[PDB]
Symmetry: D2
Subunit: 265 residues, 4 copies
């Protein structure tokens, strides 16, 4: 199944996010790298947040070569609140938007551990990164957003947070489920200051994780997808662009699946 | 609370929906009229479907005066399948998109009847219009969409279909609830042909219905809205534009609230 | 290699406790399938049950079978639940005041075992499914809530489906839409009727052994690795109408063994 | 002018039926509030209960009170549920194999009665709420599911909240996030554990009279026009661990009288 909906270049590169400073976590690989690409294409300045300085610097060099938006490095572990704040403030920029995309889904020899064999320290690390890392950026940035009465937040859930995916472990499902109600609650607290908070729940996206899934499983997942293909990272990025744009100006608290019909709930 | 997110004109009038034929039901007043405005502004051809020929013709004259997209008249009752098909085909156009916006919410002296006083014929009429009218356009248009492997559908639910609103009667809540699971099911049936199906669930929108609600009730509803205002019809229209655009190309089966945080569920 | 054995057996002493003594319970679709098992369960709990279904002979036979149990009592209510006037007349003819209704009547039309897709669906078929599954459930609630409200006493259980919350390839779009309608209808009713102490809930069954490769695939998709039994749906309807769910209202509880969770 | 009287009274003969005889049920947060009422209910149904809470004196007093009822039995399990090793050691010290756990332990920190907003929230406070409400619930499930899986027998009930599905202005964001986590965690567990006949469900209470203008506003928002009683939450936990919910798994059932339905 091929791609059917192609956005013309003149629309793809419109400066919809000019004069915006957008923090993107997990931006050096995968969906986060595609989200960074899309915001730069829309003329935003992006903060490239990821773990390894070389990965972050390479990403900034790639993006800055496009002659569109600008990319600045923010190398840190999002679960370390003080290190995150220090790396954000080292840029000298004030970020009006955060896309929380960093996330982990640990496996062992390619398979997720079941709850009865799950190491507590693995559970805790996944909670720290997937859930508390998303709180951390929001705690860091919302004082400024509230004072400015201006801000946009997009979090990343998963269809596995709303129904069972046999590909993930229980910590992943629990943390992605947490994001949904967290996003509603945040939308209510921050709405009075005109700040909007939404989440994306991707299904199965063409990403490095695909090679780690057994080929029969990926085949079955595509068979379980009405649109009959994996999603592209750029399609998730299009949703993050829209949720942070003036064309979703009354949309808040929502979790939008980006999944082609897979595992609807 | 004033509007904070203003889309520049150069983006508002971009020809994102050029060469698209978009059927809009309930297009002569309210949110549907704003949806028709938005699609014409994006260079689509729109089929103006509403009950009264004079209302429909006036709407087409207004829209065609903009020098952007084109509007054609489709005067019919969406609950009458044969009359709907006849009015669609009288235009000589093939519609690749339908926005099901027509809906009714009957009240008596400004108040909704409770279930224990609800006339069965009133229940049935609301079901006929709100639910079966939405099926009718989809039944009429999906043979062509499936054959073309091309099509977009947007339905209209309500936050009252997912949680209780004291402003509506039970037929309204039931029909708007129906839309949510109907939309998921349709997305799964039509996805193999690359057709996407989504729904919008508006909260409280600045529309003629506002005057029919007691002022204390509207005041309380705005107080229950985190973003502290009614939504604008154009903000719902922005969501319909996006859900029918190439920038939501992997989004299907979703119900997106357009409600500023009111009655999140 | 598919179906697991039953693991949770209620003892007879507890199965037959008079938990619903002095209750009058209307059950639609009661002549066969899940509805027949719901009727059996309420009679076992010493309730009086109204057996509502289409065919008088089927309804009369069901009443005779249940009344032979020597526990609760069963009375006949032969009518099409989508016909409000006929429903009211049939209820009136029993002389009973029903404090509870379990809306179980429902249809899922297929054609030689295959559901029609939306693009090929006859509008008359869509309308009939809406009339029975959705408006038939409204009809009983409209008929009975005046009395329930006046008494500040009543219990309602509606029947949704996992297919109303996510896609089941076994059903057509009218079924999905009507079962989806029940979920928000049930929340709305719970709020309207709550001030009068009336509770309103719904059940969303998965795949229940009622009236083969398709069922094997459904079992493969069910974590608990079996079909549900009609009596297990009946246990949920008993609980949702009992004093032991006294603060539970507006809820849709799946009865599905993990199938199609949403 | 707010609270309605109780309308649905379970008779004593049915309240004290031995529905959970020969069951070993671990209850976290059992020394007060809803957890104490859950413990009371299981003992009334002749179960053996593990009373898990922080303070040994509180836990010992609770066991003494319950054991004086002459029905089920209560054993002490004093530990912080967020400490996996301490939890396992305290369970091991009872010498009991628990076939059921009700995860009720939870915290909702406030400051002089007001929840902190996200922009002013101490990260340490967020982390502690995550550790107790979410990871503490994982900890008991990790400790007990090896035995449940090996036996192909077990029941789990977790505790969410209506605030995990929609906004409650009474709670802070950590509470909302952790209670939201429980819903999808429960579905995932139901699927993983279902092949072994283990059922996993959750309760989402609304506003329960546990440890005034704020509560009056909550009653005004509740269709049934009263606070819930702890025993009514306990009735749901009894049912979800009983043979009469034998095909129900992965579900989150609100216990809220219509408050904040979502
Ligand atoms: N790929 C899919 O199909 C899919 C589906 C549903 C949801 N998601 C979600 O989308 C997001 C992106 O996933 P992906 O597939 O692109 O993953 P990925 O592993 O390819 O990339 C994740 C990136 O985040 C970074 N990261 C991890 N932990 C971090 C930390 N503590 N601090 C900072 N950066 C950190 C990694 O270094 C990496 O660059 C995740 O939240 C994931 O759960 C992905
Ligand atoms: N206004 C709100 O706050 C709000 C909130 C949630 C959902 N909605 C939904 O948005 C949609 C638009 O509502 P609105 O407030 O603009 O209403 P409206 O009453 O102002 O306009 C509805 C339009 O639909 C037309 N219509 C009605 N029945 C029709 C039929 N059988 N065939 C064809 N056209 C028909 C009417 O003539 C009218 O022009 C409805 O589906 C409504 O349920 C509105
Ligand atoms: N069996 C399942 O796996 C399953 C799954 C999900 C939901 N459900 C729902 O459970 C309910 C019972 O299903 P079942 O499997 O027992 O079905 P069934 O077809 O075996 O029995 C349904 C009964 O309802 C009666 N009925 C139908 N239309 C009626 C009408 N207009 N008036 C009065 N009675 C009418 C039928 O005559 C029959 O006795 C239905 O609402 C169904 O949609 C069933
Ligand atoms: N009361 C309500 O209205 C309401 C509403 C929704 C959800 N809930 C949930 O119901 C559950 C019970 O609430 P409650 O109102 O009875 O609260 P409570 O504060 O009265 O009692 C909770 C009990 O848990 C214990 N506990 C706390 N942290 C613990 C830990 N780390 N280890 C062991 N025990 C610990 C406390 O000591 C206490 O005995 C909680 O999960 C709560 O979030 C309550």
């Amino acid at each position: 199944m091929e791609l059917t909906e192609i956005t013309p270049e003149s629309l793809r590169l419109r400066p919809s996010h000019k004069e915006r400073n957008v923090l993107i976590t997990g931006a050096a690989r995968g969906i986060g790298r595609a989200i960074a690409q899309a915001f730069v294409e829309r003329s935003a300045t992006v903060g490239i947040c990821d773990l390894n300085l070389a990965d972050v610097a390479r990403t900034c060099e790639e993006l800055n070569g496009l002659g569109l938006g600008r990319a600045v490095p923010i190398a840190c572990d999002v679960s370390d609140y003080d290190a995150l704040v220090a790396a954000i403030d080292d840029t000298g920029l004030v970020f009006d938007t955060v896309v929380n995309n960093a996330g982990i889904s640990p496996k062992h020899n390619g398979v997720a551990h079941k709850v009865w064999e799950m190491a507590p320290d693995e559970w805790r690390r996944v909670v720290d990164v997937n859930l508390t890392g998303t709180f951390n950026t929001i705690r860091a940035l919302t004082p400024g957003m509230v004072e400015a009465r201006r801000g946009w937040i997009v979090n990343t859930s998963s269809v596995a947070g709303k129904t069972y995916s046999p590909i993930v472990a229980c910590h992943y499902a629990a943390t992605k489920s947490a994001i949904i109600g967290f996003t509603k609650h945040l939308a209510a607290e921050l709405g009075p200051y005109s700040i909007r908070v939404n989440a994306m729940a991707p299904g199965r996206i063409a990403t490095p994780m695909v090679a780690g899934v057994a080929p029969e499983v990926n085949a079955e997942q595509v068979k379980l997808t009405p649109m009959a293909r994996l999603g592209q990272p750029a399609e998730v990025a299009d949703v993050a662009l829209w949720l942070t744009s003036t064309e979703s100006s009354f949309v808040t608290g929502q979790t939008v699946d980006v999944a082609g019909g897979l595992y609807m709930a």
